[PDB]
Structures are given as structure tokens and as C-alpha cells.
Amino acid sequence: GEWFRDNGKHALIVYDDLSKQAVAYRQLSLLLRRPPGREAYPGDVFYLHSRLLERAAKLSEKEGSGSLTALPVIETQGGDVSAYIPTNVISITDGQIFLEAELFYKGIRPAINVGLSVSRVGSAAQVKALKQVAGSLKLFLAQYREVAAFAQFGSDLDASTKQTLVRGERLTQLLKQNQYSPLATEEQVPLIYAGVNGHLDGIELSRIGEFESSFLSYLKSNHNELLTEIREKGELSKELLASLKSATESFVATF
Amino acid sequence: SRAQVKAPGILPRRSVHEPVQTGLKAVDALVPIGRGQRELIIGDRQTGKTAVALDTILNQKRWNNGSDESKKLYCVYVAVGQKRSTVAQLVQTLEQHDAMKYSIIVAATASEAAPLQYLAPFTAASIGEWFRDNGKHALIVYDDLSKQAVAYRQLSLLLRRPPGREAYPGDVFYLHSRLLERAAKLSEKEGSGSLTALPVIETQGGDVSAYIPTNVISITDGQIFLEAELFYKGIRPAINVGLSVSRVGSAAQVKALKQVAGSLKLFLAQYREVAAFAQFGSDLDASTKQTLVRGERLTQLLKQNQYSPLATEEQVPLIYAGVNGHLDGIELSRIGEFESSFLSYLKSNHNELLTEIREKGELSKELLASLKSATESFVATF
Amino acid sequence: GEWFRDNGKHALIVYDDLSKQAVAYRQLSLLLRRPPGREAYPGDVFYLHSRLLERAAKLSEKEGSGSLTALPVIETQGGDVSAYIPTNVISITDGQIFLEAELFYKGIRPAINVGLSVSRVGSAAQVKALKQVAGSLKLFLAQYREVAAFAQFSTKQTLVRGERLTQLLKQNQYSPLATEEQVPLIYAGVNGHLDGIELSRIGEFESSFLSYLKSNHNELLTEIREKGELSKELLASLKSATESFVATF
Amino acid sequence: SYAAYLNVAAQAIRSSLKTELQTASVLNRSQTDAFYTQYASEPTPITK
Amino acid sequence: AEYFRDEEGQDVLLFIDNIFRFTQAGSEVSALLGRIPSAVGYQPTLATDMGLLQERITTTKKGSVTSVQAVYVPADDLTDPAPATTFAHLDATTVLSRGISELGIYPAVDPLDSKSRLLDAAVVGQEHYDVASKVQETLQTYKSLQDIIAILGMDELSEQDKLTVERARKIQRFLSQPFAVAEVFTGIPGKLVRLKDTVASFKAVLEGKYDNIPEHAFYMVGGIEDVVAKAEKLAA
Amino acid sequence: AEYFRDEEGQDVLLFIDNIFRFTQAGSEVSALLGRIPSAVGYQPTLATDMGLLQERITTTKKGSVTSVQAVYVPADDLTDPAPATTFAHLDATTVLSRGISELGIYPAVDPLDSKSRLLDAAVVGQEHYDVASKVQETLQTYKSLQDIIAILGMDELSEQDKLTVERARKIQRFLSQPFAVAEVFTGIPGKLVRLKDTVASFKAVLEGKYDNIPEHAFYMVGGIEDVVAKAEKLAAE
Amino acid sequence: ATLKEVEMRLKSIKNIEKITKTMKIVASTRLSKAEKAKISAKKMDEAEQLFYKNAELIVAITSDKGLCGSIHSQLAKAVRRHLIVTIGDKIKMQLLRTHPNNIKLSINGIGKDAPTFQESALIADKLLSVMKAGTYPKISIFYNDPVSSLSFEPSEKPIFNVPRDLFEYTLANQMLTAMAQGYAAEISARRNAMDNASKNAGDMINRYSILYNRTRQAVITNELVDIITGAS
Numbered sequence A: 001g002e003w004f005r006d007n008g009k010h011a012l013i014v015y016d017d018l019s020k021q022a023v024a025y026r027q028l029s030l031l032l033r034r035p036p037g038r039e040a041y042p043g044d045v046f047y048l049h050s051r052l053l054e055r056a057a058k059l060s061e062k063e064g065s066g067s068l069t070a071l072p073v074i075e076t077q078g079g080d081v082s083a084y085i086p087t088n089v090i091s092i093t094d095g096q097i098f099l100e101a102e103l104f105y106k107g108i109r110p111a112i113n114v115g116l117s118v119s120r121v122g123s124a125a126q127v128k129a130l131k132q133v134a135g136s137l138k139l140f141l142a143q144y145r146e147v148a149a150f151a152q153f154g155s156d157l158d159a160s161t162k163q164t165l166v167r168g169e170r171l172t173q174l175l176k177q178n179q180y181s182p183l184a185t186e187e188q189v190p191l192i193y194a195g196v197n198g199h200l201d202g203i204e205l206s207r208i209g210e211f212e213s214s215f216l217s218y219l220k221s222n223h224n225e226l227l228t229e230i231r232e233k234g235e236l237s238k239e240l241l242a243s244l245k246s247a248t249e250s251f252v253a254t255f
Numbered sequence B: 001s002r003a004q005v006k007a008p009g010i011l012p013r014r015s016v017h018e019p020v021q022t023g024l025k026a027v028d029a030l031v032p033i034g035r036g037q038r039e040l041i042i043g044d045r046q047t048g049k050t051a052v053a054l055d056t057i058l059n060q061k062r063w064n065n066g067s068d069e070s071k072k073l074y075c076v077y078v079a080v081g082q083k084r085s086t087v088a089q090l091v092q093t094l095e096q097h098d099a100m101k102y103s104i105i106v107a108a109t110a111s112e113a114a115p116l117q118y119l120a121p122f123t124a125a126s127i128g129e130w131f132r133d134n135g136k137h138a139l140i141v142y143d144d145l146s147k148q149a150v151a152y153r154q155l156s157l158l159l160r161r162p163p164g165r166e167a168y169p170g171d172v173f174y175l176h177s178r179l180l181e182r183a184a185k186l187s188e189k190e191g192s193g194s195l196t197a198l199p200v201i202e203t204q205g206g207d208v209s210a211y212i213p214t215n216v217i218s219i220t221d222g223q224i225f226l227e228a229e230l231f232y233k234g235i236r237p238a239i240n241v242g243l244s245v246s247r248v249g250s251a252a253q254v255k256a257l258k259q260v261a262g263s264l265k266l267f268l269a270q271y272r273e274v275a276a277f278a279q280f281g282s283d284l285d286a287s288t289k290q291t292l293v294r295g296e297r298l299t300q301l302l303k304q305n306q307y308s309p310l311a312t313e314e315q316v317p318l319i320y321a322g323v324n325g326h327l328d329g330i331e332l333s334r335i336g337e338f339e340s341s342f343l344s345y346l347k348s349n350h351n352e353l354l355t356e357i358r359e360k361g362e363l364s365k366e367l368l369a370s371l372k373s374a375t376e377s378f379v380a381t382f
Numbered sequence C: 001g002e003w004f005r006d007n008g009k010h011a012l013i014v015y016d017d018l019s020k021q022a023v024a025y026r027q028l029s030l031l032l033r034r035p036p037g038r039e040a041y042p043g044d045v046f047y048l049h050s051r052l053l054e055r056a057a058k059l060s061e062k063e064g065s066g067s068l069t070a071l072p073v074i075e076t077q078g079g080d081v082s083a084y085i086p087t088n089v090i091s092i093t094d095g096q097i098f099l100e101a102e103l104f105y106k107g108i109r110p111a112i113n114v115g116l117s118v119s120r121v122g123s124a125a126q127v128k129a130l131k132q133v134a135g136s137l138k139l140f141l142a143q144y145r146e147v148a149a150f151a152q153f154s155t156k157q158t159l160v161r162g163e164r165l166t167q168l169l170k171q172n173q174y175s176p177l178a179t180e181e182q183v184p185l186i187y188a189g190v191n192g193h194l195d196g197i198e199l200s201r202i203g204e205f206e207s208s209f210l211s212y213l214k215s216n217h218n219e220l221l222t223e224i225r226e227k228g229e230l231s232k233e234l235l236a237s238l239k240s241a242t243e244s245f246v247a248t249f
Numbered sequence D: 001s002y003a004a005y006l007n008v009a010a011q012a013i014r015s016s017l018k019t020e021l022q023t024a025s026v027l028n029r030s031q032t033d034a035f036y037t038q039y040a041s042e043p044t045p046i047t048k
Numbered sequence E: 001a002e003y004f005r006d007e008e009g010q011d012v013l014l015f016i017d018n019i020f021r022f023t024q025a026g027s028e029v030s031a032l033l034g035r036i037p038s039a040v041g042y043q044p045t046l047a048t049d050m051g052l053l054q055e056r057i058t059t060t061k062k063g064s065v066t067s068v069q070a071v072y073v074p075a076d077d078l079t080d081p082a083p084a085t086t087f088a089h090l091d092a093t094t095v096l097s098r099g100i101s102e103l104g105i106y107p108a109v110d111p112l113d114s115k116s117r118l119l120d121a122a123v124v125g126q127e128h129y130d131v132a133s134k135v136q137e138t139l140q141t142y143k144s145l146q147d148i149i150a151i152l153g154m155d156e157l158s159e160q161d162k163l164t165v166e167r168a169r170k171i172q173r174f175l176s177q178p179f180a181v182a183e184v185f186t187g188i189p190g191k192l193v194r195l196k197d198t199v200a201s202f203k204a205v206l207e208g209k210y211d212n213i214p215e216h217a218f219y220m221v222g223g224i225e226d227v228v229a230k231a232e233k234l235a236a
Numbered sequence F: 001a002e003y004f005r006d007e008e009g010q011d012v013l014l015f016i017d018n019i020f021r022f023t024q025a026g027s028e029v030s031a032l033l034g035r036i037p038s039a040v041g042y043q044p045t046l047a048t049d050m051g052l053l054q055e056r057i058t059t060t061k062k063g064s065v066t067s068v069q070a071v072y073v074p075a076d077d078l079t080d081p082a083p084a085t086t087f088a089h090l091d092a093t094t095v096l097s098r099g100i101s102e103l104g105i106y107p108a109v110d111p112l113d114s115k116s117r118l119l120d121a122a123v124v125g126q127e128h129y130d131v132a133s134k135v136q137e138t139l140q141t142y143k144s145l146q147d148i149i150a151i152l153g154m155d156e157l158s159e160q161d162k163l164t165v166e167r168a169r170k171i172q173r174f175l176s177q178p179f180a181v182a183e184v185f186t187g188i189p190g191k192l193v194r195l196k197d198t199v200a201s202f203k204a205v206l207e208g209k210y211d212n213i214p215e216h217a218f219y220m221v222g223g224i225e226d227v228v229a230k231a232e233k234l235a236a237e
Numbered sequence G: 001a002t003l004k005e006v007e008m009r010l011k012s013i014k015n016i017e018k019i020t021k022t023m024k025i026v027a028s029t030r031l032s033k034a035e036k037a038k039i040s041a042k043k044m045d046e047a048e049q050l051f052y053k054n055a056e057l058i059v060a061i062t063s064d065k066g067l068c069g070s071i072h073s074q075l076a077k078a079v080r081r082h083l084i085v086t087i088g089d090k091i092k093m094q095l096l097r098t099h100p101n102n103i104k105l106s107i108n109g110i111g112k113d114a115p116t117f118q119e120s121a122l123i124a125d126k127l128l129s130v131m132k133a134g135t136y137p138k139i140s141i142f143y144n145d146p147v148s149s150l151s152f153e154p155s156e157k158p159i160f161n162v163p164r165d166l167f168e169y170t171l172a173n174q175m176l177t178a179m180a181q182g183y184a185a186e187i188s189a190r191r192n193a194m195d196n197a198s199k200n201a202g203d204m205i206n207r208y209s210i211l212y213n214r215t216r217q218a219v220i221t222n223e224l225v226d227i228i229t230g231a232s
């Protein structure tokens, strides 16, 4: 990857997975009879994963402007993050995507723990359209992960939080997407505008997918201009945002 | 015979199908032991392990006094790391109950050099192996293998061998395996014998995750798990029926007892599913309340006194009463009475049912109907 | 300190703190490749402290009557007294003063946990006038702790008495009061005469009452000083002013 | 049965309310959903 | 097994009972040989020994050595390095839980602890996956409501929750199956069901199309085209 | 002690305070003798070096020895190898625990972890054994309910359990006792309570004869007549 | 003792905290309707009692469900202190252990929701058609008065062709008022009790978190000690 980095090209290196690199180095060191540390890992394992990871960098226009992005995978045992290798890699990386088995089993996939996941960098990188439209999404999702423990109870449900329980359910159904089907930003931001602005409230929770598949068509055909400008120009100028509201309200009146 | 002598292989064995009648309701009825089985008696300090093994040893004098060498279960008790005064109390117990004439006691006490503690279980296994190989049945109690493991640890570390987990040597599993696997049941080509192992393990804090526990739990065919929290509640023997399991299972239970033990087990499993709300039994659902009541009364119904094994003829009517629901009307405290009175009635009346639960060993529908009759009658009198 | 002890003089040695001495001996030992034990300390971290604290002794007049008193300090991680080094020094020493963070942050300073604090020499060292007055206050407050813990889950009398006793014991830093000044208060404390005083007023009491005896009653403090023990006549003369001031207060 | 009579008349006046006019309070005000047992132990359970 | 694959030219399935003891003996030999013990006492060569065993178990041009490996979990702790390393190679999990035998649901496979990687629509198909997901959702709902159904009666459930519970029990018992090897054990004729004939059946159950019929009729049958036969016998 | 037992024939009682310091001593030297340390850090010989000491302390047909041994528990971990090995060697074991002492209940003997072989109806008699079993059952019920108490409050408990809990609290506290040697640091005069009086008093408490008496009167009194006396005193004052 | 055990203990206590926290919110949601059902009935009562101001059996009202804290305990204390017909399984249970021969009539199932005049009227109707409360000098109602969002007091209100119809009516009206105030007191007591329980759960979680940290450190120290003994 350092080649693309130094020669002015952008790269992406996926380590799947570094827990097994740590195990391999542990074997290699214990058989060399080097003194072990915690969890039988050698002392410098922090040096192992740091020397590996932070080679990832974004270079100056004076050194080539290339880059290399590192997505190291770690398999936590029983969800424990206090283990030694996880404790180190969480500290080395700029952020984490925490995939939760409790979500994976419920059929929420990708099972990202929106609460524990964090990107202490990427907020400055996000495609502007998605920053605009998802400004409210993290708050809505945290409120939902609070209120959802109350999902089961009857008509006594408070009206104030009923809107939370609606929007969060719809947003959870939106954020799940089938494997090997990655979506373009132009297809991403319209759905998140529909969700955050609560247009999906009038749709049954089992039909959200039929929305996401159908809505993309309504956009692609009826509003090619909007998707095209969102991808090509990169941001949702107010005029395009009004186009987006109009298109969503139109399809939803249809749907 | 040599101490370390190879265990019998696949071909000569025959499957465990006949019972080691312990007389302890909580064992015969929920975690049975067959002639040839290997059952771990695992529990914390002073939780009742030796008491289970010794009640088993004592019960056999019902059969060992008779005429048929097939029913007789001769016993070997290996005392490893115990103090000699405890072995003296043990032999005094066995003498009071006359059980010494068919018991052999092999003592490598704490003061005996470590090599003899490491070797004693092997030589006791070689003793029992004679009964096994000559067409008789034996029962060997290792009390306890944790101390054999400690003796072998001393031996190994002083031999400058490298330690593994818990400072125990890297081949303690091989030790306990080539010890226990010698317990077997043989086939008619080799004398129809057996040798049954009841190894004890001293779990610190109930941690089944320690090394020697982790090994023995995997070597043995089952475990009788003794718990202190059950002991102090008067559930004695303190057998955690849930954690306790037998892989031979029904093949070892007496037929008459298998019949009722299936339902006993089902009801106690429901009780364990509900137990989290046992202290809130009032407001719970009707079915949950029924299961809490009956589970509590069954758990009480299993407790019995030290040095007092009940024969199967006395276990069967009692487990029948518990399962079919007659005891649901009895205060939880009076159950101890119900047994001691109820069995007496079955001798004062319906003696044929006990006599045939012993002779036939099988609860034919006629016997089950007469038993229902007697149970209704006494719960009416009670 | 042993020079004072041996030559007939009296000493006091404050070790501040032995947790760090134990850490230092742990370093010294592990670097010497001594095999680690519990809490990675060496097996003889006990001897390190026993041969230190056993030297604090009180001698007979054959050896000159001297003495050496030891006030070792131990830092407890997370307030757990079950750790290795804490337990070792509790086993070596004749008692313990346990200072609790929950009390300290609440403002109960000094933060003496009366339940866990105990001195096995006890009254034998206490000034006679305080033994004569305190009765069994330590066990009363030890029981008050559990009474309050279960109250959270006529007990009100024990609980009131314990709250007021706990409040009475507070003291300001660098401001020590001699025993002439402690004997008076602990009577109103132990004999529950303080039950008629609101909690927030106790800080006003302790000084005002101290001012009353010192202002008027030189006859009582100049006794308890020179005598050190109460005759039932002076005990009466103290119960009297206590009842009088408390009725005034 | 004066309060009982008013209860019957009330169920009448409540069912008389237009189906498009009933608030859930009205359908609730008809739901007794209770039982009684005479009483030692209960000789007979029944609705109330 | 690999000879049956490479030279015999046909697929074979290899039973390893138990792999925990492969890892255990590896730790024993490593401690004996003086290799510094790793985490809880297992060998440093744990992962590479396991790999050198497993990765011979694979498919190739001439055939495949399938493996069904019993995995003993010491102290029921799936986080022990031995099971944790075994889990990195296996992609289908079948949990035989005594709690499922208490309900009498033989062959006692835990419908929820058991999991498989091939359940993806890409491998089994979107239909199979939708059906299995509905089954899992219903059974997870029942297992969740298991506490509330005890604290409160089933009359307290919503009709849709009650329906999911009843169809969950029926799904549970339709999952039971008479084995052919076990026909001597209890006489049962022991039927075996194709995969398609299983998806089409649990589908008919899930949709409520076959909710008309009782619980015990779903017990020990080789398909809904046999559950209806059993139910016709019972109704008659 | 051995000579007083065997060559002089008299009845001996041998106090050892504290036997753990024996094993710990063997530990301190084990590393310097070149042994590979065992578990948490004790010497390999722990199981045998102890026995050769412990096995000599015993009763014999030559003479009787009554031994009372203090067994320090490091870090309060009764799982530490030394106490765990010692437990096997003792007929009667009274485990003093820190939690009971924090509750102000001296003499701090854990009423449950403590055990003795001679607590059998054959030796102590059936009445004593039933009383002891009811006591242990009540205290274990309290310790099991403690979490429900701590979270949901005592009021959630049923009448049977509220009574069992109040009785357990009375009993754990009635087990307290002032020792004549502890007076120099507790003030309360010492008490000796005979065996029959203890059995009868705990029987009376189990039977509910004194449910009316408050807990605080059961503390540090001695017998039950002194429970009554302290109750009268609290009522008067 | 070991890390997995402290971890499962902490997880169970966390689940308990979660459950009690959800229950608090549910109770707070029901409180909104209980308050209004209490307000209306308080106005109706004051109106009816204006007549008793100008002019002039024990029915024990509680719920059927527990976790209300001291509600049922305090009402049973009031009943025994004053000292029968019970409304609710719980007060019936409190009384059945002490005076089985005194319970004449038990009503169940009304505790789940706010009282309605139908319920009160039919309960009175059973008192008049079964218990035959007619012309009894001994008639009074024991019930909980909700004093604040954090307190309730056990209370008693006495009971007394129109001069007879008015008793036959105020029976139902005062029973309604008592059930309404008892429902408000029960809901408030449960909110307070579950809040207290969740706070206690957080405290226990803090304690077991201290223990988790200590056991983590001890586990690591022990394991690395053993490894180091091996590496000699």
C-alpha cells in the first residue's frame, strides 16, 4: 500500500484479522523463548500493531498527496473489549465500527453499534450531502436505543416518545442493507432525508425495503437531475434539497 | 498386579446396563451410576462428597450378604491426602454398619511421601481390577484426585519438569485418564466383570474452570455436583441436579425408577426454569405457581439422612407420590415426616407392591394402579 | 526510634507509607529474579513488615521503661482492605484506623470508619477519664452502620443516636483538643443527651459547650488535667453542666 | 340497586353514543374485567 | 478420509470426537517439550496446529472431506482459547442442548444456538433465508416472552404475540424428526426430508396456512404433507 | 506436646497460633532452595511438609491431644492453597470472616462456612441438630434473599420470608458474644453461655417465642434471659 | 470468584436495572391518567360530601399486583391497627394469614386500571345482594390516600325511599373515590419503588464493577505469574 501512498494514489488495506497476527507473533516469540507479557503476548505487541497501522497516512501535496486507509479487523471474544489486543488497537485507531452480535441475531445487518462506534476524524471527510441530511441521525438513533427497551408496552405508550419509537424503527430498517449491495452516495442521501424528515412514518415497518428499492427507481427515473447533481457536484444546495423534499413527498403520496 | 497396567480397550468391554444402587434418591433417580461408569463427585470443601461415596458403599450390604456374586458390589476406598484419623473414623463407620467385610481401604495419607500419594490410586485400581477381571463387580472411590494432582505436582516440580496451568505438570490429564479409564465393564469373553469409579474433586469456590476440574469433568462419564448453598438450605445431599449429569443415564436406572424419574426430571427442569421467581411465588401465574410448588416439594423430597440409604422399593413409591402430585397438599416442612410415615404404611399395607418393585424391578400397570391406591389412601389419612 | 526506646525515652514512628515500601521491595525482589507470589509481591513481603513493626514495643523497667509506637500508613486500592499487603499489616499491627472515601467526600473528616476501625489495646491505653465515659461507643456505631444500611432497605432511636455521634466526632485539620476537652463531649454523645439537638447544630454545640466549661468551669478541666480520672463526684459535676447547657442549648 | 340502576342506565347511555363519537374512555367504562369469590377458603369463583 | 477423496473420487464426511482433546493433547505435548505455555496453558502452536489439521478438510477437484467435529467447551466458556480457535475454522454450529430434550424435541438441536454461515441467500437462496429468518424471529420472540408468560399468564399477551407464540411451539415441534437409525430404539419409522421439501413445509406453517391443526400432530413427522395425514388420522 | 502425650500419659491440649506462618515460612525459603514455585507462589512441598507437621497433632491410644489451630487466610481468599490444604486436616473448623465483623457481630464466626464433624444427631442429639439446621437454613435464606432486599426492598418479600429474614437478623446477632478478654477493647463484660442454654435459647427464637423482642436486645447479651433483660433496659431507657 | 462469574453477576444486575428503569417510565406514563381519574372523582366526592357537611363490614381497597413497596403493607397495618371485605389479591393475602375466618368477600382483577363507576357499582351490588350490607352499623372503607408523588397515607372513610338510596349510592361513589385514590397511590408508590430499586441496582453495579476490576487485575497477575514460572 505504501507504494500507492508515495506515488500519488489512494489505497485501502484491510487486515482480517489482527488478533490472529497477535497470536502468530505470540507463538513466534514464545518459541524464540523471548520473555512474554500479559496474556502471554510479547511485550511490544503495541509496537507490532502501531508499526503496522499508523503507516496509514494522508500525505501533503508536497510529498505526493496520496493516501492509505487501514481498516483493521479484530475478533473480540464474547464482546469483551478490555482484552489486551483489543485494548491496544482501540487506542491506536482513529475510530471504531463495533459490530454487535445482539443486533446481528435480530437481523439488523450490518450490525453496527451506533453508540459505541465512533470516528474521531471522519466527520471532516463525510460527503457534504450526508453531513447535511444525517445531522440529526445520530441523535435520533441514540434516542431510539434509549426508548426501544420500551417497545413492547401497550396503548399507554406516551405520545411524546411514540414519535421516537416510530422514527427509530424506520431508521433501523433503513440502515440495514443486504450484503454485497453497496449503495452510491446519490442513492444514500435521499433515503436518509426521507428517514430523518420522517417521511417514512406512513409506511409499514415490513415494507421499508420495498420503499428503498422502489424509491431509488422514482429518483432514478423521475428525478435523474437530483441524483446526478448530488453525485457530480457533491452537495445538497438548497435548491436540490427542495427538489429532494418534493420528490420524497411525491413518492410517499404515491406509496 | 502392577500399578500402572493398561486399561481394557474397545473390543472386550460391554455397555453399562446395570445399576450401582446408591440408595440416595437424588442420584438413583436423576444421575444414575452403572457398573462400569465413571462419576465425578465434585464440590467445595465439606460439601458432602465423601458422604455420597460412603452412603453408596454402605447400601450394598443389602446385596453383598446374599448368594449371587453378580449383585455384590465390592468397594475400594482410596484416601489420598486425608489425615489418618479421618480414615480411622471411616473404618469405624464401615464397621458399625458391617460394611468392612466387603470394603478395602487403601490409605496414602497426607504424611505419606508424595510418591505414595501419586501411586496409591493406581494400586487401588489394580486391586479393584482383580475383581473386575475375575467376574465380580467393584466400586473404587478416589478421595480425592485433587490431592493426587498436588502430589504429582510436587513430584514434577521437584524433578525440575516444566509447569503448565495452575503449576500442575503438562501430563496430569494423562495421569487421571490412564487411572480412570481402567474402570470398565467387560464382556462375556472376559468374565462379565466391572469396576466403577467415583472420583472426588475439591473445587475451590465452585470453580469448574480450574485445571484438574476441567480435566476430570471431561474424563468422567458424569458428575454429581455438590453445592454449599443447597447444603445450608437443608437440601442434603446437596446435589445440584441441574449441574449434575450422567451420560449413561437411563441405561443405569432401575426400570421401575426410570419410569418415574423421567417425569421427576422434567418437573425439576421446569422448576429450574422458573426458580428466578421462587421468592415471589404468590403473584405468579397459575402454571408457574404449580411448577414452583411441585419443584420445591420434589427438591425437599430428595433430602435424606446421612448413613441412611433407601432401597429402590422405597424410592419408587416416594418419587411416584412426588411426580403424580399427591404431595402438593403437604406443607413443605412435613415432607420429612411423610416419607418416614409413608414407607412404614407401605410395609404395614400394600407390602406386595414393595416386594414386587424389588423382585420384578418393573412397575407393571397393576402395580402402578395399586400404588396410586395406596398413595391416595395415605394422603387421605395424612 | 529504637535508640529512644532502648535508652528509656519514648518515641513514635510514622511510616508513610508501607504500600510503597512493599512496591519497592517487590521491585528489588523481582529484579533479583525472586519468584512472584500473591499480587506479584515476593513471598517474604510479610517478613519485611513484621521485622519492622514488631520493633515498636513497650519495655519493662529492667530495660528502661521506654517505648516505640508505630503508626504505619497503607494506601488501599479502591478502598478494598482485602488486598495482600493491607491484610499482612493488619495481621502484624495491633489495630487499624480505616479512613473511608465515601465519608471523606461527604465531609465526615476525619473519615474514621468506626466499624472497621479497632484498637486491640483499647481502654488500657485510653485515658482513664475516657474509658470511664465512652462505654461501648465503638460497637454502638458499628451497629448503627448496619442499622442504617437496613433502614435504607424504635430503631429510629439507635439511628438518631448514631447519626449524632458520627457528627459529633468531626474535627478540623491542625486543630487538636486535649483530653480535658474530649471527655465532656463524649458523655453527651454516648448517653444520648444529644438526641434533643438537631444535627446541623452540633458544630455550634462542640465549641459553645467547650467555651462554657472553659469560661466558667475551670474547676472541671483543671481537675481532669491533674487527676486524669473522674471521681463519681466530678462525674456528677459533669453530668450536671451537661444537662444544664443542653437544656439551655 | 340505586347505584346499580344508575350503572345499567349508564351502559345504556354509553352504548347510545354514536360509534363515531365514542372515545376509548367509553369502551373502557364498560370493561369491568373483575371477579369475585365468596369467603376459611373461597366456596365459589365468579365474574363480578 | 483424504484417500477416499483423492483416490476413491467421492465425497466423505469425517467425524472428529473430540477436537477439544486435539488442542488439549497439543498443549500437553508442548508443555512436556518445554515450550513456554501461552494463555491459560495452551500451546503457542495452537492456531497453526489447528490449521494444519483443518485445512486438509476441504473441497477440491476430486471431492471433499466434510467434517463434523464435536467441540467440548470446558466450563461452558466459549471464550476459552481452545473453543475460540476451533470456532475460527468451523462455519456451521449445531448445539445439542439438554433443555431441548426436556421439551422432548428430538433430535434436540437448539433452534437458536445452532447457526450456519451458509444461511446466506447467496448459497441457500432468498426463499430459504426468508423462511429461516421467520422461524428464528418467531422462536426468539417466544424465548423472549418466556419470562413474561411465567410472570403473567398467556391471556395477557396480544393476539399477535399469542399467535407468534403458538406458531413458535408448532415450529418447535415440527423441527422434531424420527431418525432411521433410531427406529429400533422406539419403533418410529424414521423419515428423512429433502431441503426443498423442508422449506416448502415450514413456509406453509409460518404463513398460518396450516395453523388450523394441533400441536401434537406436528410431532415427529417428515413433512407437512405428512402432518396433514397425521392430523387427518387424529381428527378421525 | 508429643512427650506430654506419649511418655507422660496426660491429657494435652496444643494451641498453635498461627500455623499458616509455618507454610509461609517454607515458602519464603523455597525460592532460595532452587525449587520451581507451585501455584499462587507456595512451595511444592506444601501438601507434604504440612502433613508431617499436621499428622503429628492427633489423639492416640497413648494419650489425647486437643488442638486449636489458627489458620491465617491471606487476602481473605480461602481458596489460597494453604487454607485449602489445612481444611482437610481439621475435625472442626470455625471460619472467621470480615463481613460479619464489619456488621459489628463479634466473634465474627461465619455461621455457615463453619463446620464440625461432631454436629451429628448421633453425637449432639436430635434436638440440638434440628436447632442448628433450622439456624443454618434461616441464615442461608437471608443470604439468598439479600439481593432481593438490596434491590426491591424488604417489603417485596412475602410474610413467610419477612419473618424468616427478621428471624435470621435476630439469630446472626444473637450469635454475638462478649469475651472477657475483649472487654479491654469492647467494654462489654464477658459472658460464658452453656451448651444446653444455647440450644434452648436458639430453639426458643426459632419457635418464635421472642418475635416481639427487637434485634438490638439480642446483641452482646449472652443467653436469652439477657436478651430479655436488655430488652427491658432499652424499653425503660 | 473468577472473571466469568463476576461478569454474569454484573450482567444480571444490569438487566435488573434495565427492567426496573423501564417499569418506572411505564408507571410515570400511567400516572397521567391516574391523576385525572383521581381529580374528577375528588371533585365528585367533595360535591357529594357537601351534603354531609350540611346535613350531618370493612372494605379494604388495594391492588392485585405487588412491587408497590409498602402500599399493601401499610394498608394492612392500618386495618389491623383499627381492627371484612377485601378488594385486590394482595390485601386479601395480607389478611388471610391473620384472620381467615373474617374474610367474607374478596374481589379481584380491578387493580389493573383506574376505577370506573361500573366496577364500584357492581362491587357495591355484591355487597348488597351477597354480603347484605343493609342496615349494618359497621361499615367503613380503608384505602390509600396519595399525599404526594413520594408519599401515601393509609386512611379510612366511614359509610352511612331516598334516605336509603343515598346510602346505596354513596357506597358506590365513595368506593369509586377510594379505588381512584388507591390507584394513584399505587402507581406513585411503584414509580418511587422502581426508582429506588434502579438506584440500588446502580449502586450494586458500581460495587461489582470494583470487584470486576480487582478480579481482572488478579486474574492477569496470576496468569502471568504462572507463565513466568514456566519461562524460568
Ligand SMILES: Nc1ncnc2c1ncn2[C@@H]1O[C@H](COP(=O)(O)OP(=O)(O)OP(=O)(O)O)[C@@H](O)[C@H]1O
Pocket (backbone or CB within 6 Å): B044, B045, B046, B047, B048, B049, B050, B051, B052, B200, B202, B236, B237, B304, B305, B306, B307, F087, F088, F115, F116, F117, F118, F119, F120
Ligand atoms: N447426608 C448428610 N446430611 C447432612 N449432613 C451431612 C450428610 N453427610 C455428611 N454430612 C455432614 O457434612 C460433613 C461431611 O463432609 P464430607 O466428608 O462429606 O466432605 P469431604 O469430602 O470430607 O470434604 P472435605 O474433604 O473438603 O472436608 C460433616 O460435617 C457431616 O456431618
Ligand SMILES: [Mg+2]
Pocket (backbone or CB within 6 Å): B049, B050, B143
Ligand atoms: Mg471428604
